[PDB]
Amino acid sequence: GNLITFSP
Amino acid sequence: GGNLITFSPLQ
Amino acid sequence: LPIRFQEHLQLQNLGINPANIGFSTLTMESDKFICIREKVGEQAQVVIIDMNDPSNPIRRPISADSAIMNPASKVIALKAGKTLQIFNIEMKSKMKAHTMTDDVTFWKWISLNTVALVTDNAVYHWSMEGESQPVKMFDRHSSLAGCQIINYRTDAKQKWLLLTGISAQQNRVVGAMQLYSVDRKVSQPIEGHAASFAQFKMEGNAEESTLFCFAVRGQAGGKLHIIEVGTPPTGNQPFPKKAVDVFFPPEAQNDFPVAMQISEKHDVVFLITKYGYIHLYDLETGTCIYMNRISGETIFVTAPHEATAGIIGVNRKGQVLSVCVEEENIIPYITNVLQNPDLALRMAVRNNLAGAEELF
Ligand SMILES: [Cl-]
Ligand code: NA
């Protein structure tokens, strides 16, 4: 999604 | 009614 | 200890059948009440435990598949498939009723006036205000299809909505979350087990940041994320995103996070795992403060512990237990046990506690 980025 | 709970009478 | 641990109640002492002490039959929407559904024949009852008067529970006959007390008032929400009813227990009166088009698979109070409804396809908010009916908030993401729904929660402003489900895959429990932005009208699927929102004011910011905190175990380790959601208020520094390990000992191979609550007073994350470990994390830095097994049995339901700004929960054995920061001990523990004077000083200034000054 476009909402948050984080370490998979 | 068709109530999902019943209560004791008030007296 | 940096925590105070308190057993409040053993529900079996009140004559509660331990078979009904589990996720589907016992609810604790706030620290004020516990409701337990018990069914022997076709004669279902609800046991209503007033946590300020635990020796005198109310037992009433029911025909509901689910019972959740309002967080603030002795007002019970009962459902049977599509049928929702709300009763004021003290007035013995039905105050609201609504029939949904679809089976409500999960529901929870998200405030003192709003119930969240989850169907197979959508999430609704149902306000108790006047002739308000359920309003659809979003469509469910295909990534949660076939999940058991275990949680729904929001930020303070109800602008950020989070639906959580789990499923069994390869003998592990995989968490699936849907984060929905109300303003952007967009969803993001996330592999996550337990989560909470929090309001956090950073040093030098005029306004609070809205934080999203989630914990997950993947195939090869656990992680905790603390992320600012939405555009930071004008003139606010953004919250630098935090990502930290969630430790599972080698002996806890099937363990995973099952509960999170965040202290508004102490800015600490409480994480509880299935095997019954509690973890304390600093909301600001994500630093792991404390870890310990507090329960041999799964704590399957939790709520804010209002009086201590802590976490209160029920385990499958019927133990009602609470954890909060021990304000007398936390700064000495971080200094002397963690050897982290930096974290000690930062946390001492945040809550105006003594003992963070480096003596030499
Ligand atoms: Cl009412
Ligand atoms: Na869970």
Author numbering:
A (entry chain E): 8 to 15
B (entry chain C): 7 to 17
C (entry chain A): 5 to 364
Please give sentences taken from the publication describing this entry:
Among the novel phospho‐modulated interactions, we highlight the interaction between the clathrin N‐terminal domain (NTD) and the mitotic spindle protein Hepatoma‐upregulated protein (HURP).
To shed light on the structural details of the complex, we co‐crystallised a pS839 HURP826–846 peptide with the clathrin NTD. In pocket 1, the phosphate group is clamped between the basic residues R64 and K96 (in 4.2 and 2.7 Å distance, respectively) and hence at an appropriate distance to form salt bridges with the phosphate group. In comparison, only one basic residue (K227) was found in vicinity of the phosphate group in pocket 3. Both pockets can hence accommodate the LIxF‐motif, although pocket 1 appears to be the preferred binding pocket due to the observed occupancy and due to a better accommodation of the phosphate group. Further, HURP is highly phosphorylated during mitosis, suggesting that the proline‐directed phosphorylation on S839 is a CDK target (Hsu et al, 2004; Yu et al, 2005; Wong & Fang, 2006), which prompted us to investigate the interaction in this cell cycle stage. We found that phosphorylation of S839 in the HURP832–846 peptide results in a 20‐fold increase in affinity, as demonstrated by both FP and ITC experiments (HURP832–846: FP: KD ≈ 150 μM and ITC: KD ≈ 250 μM, pS839 HURP: FP: KD < 3 μM and ITC KD = 5 μM; Fig 6A and B, Table 1, and Dataset EV10).
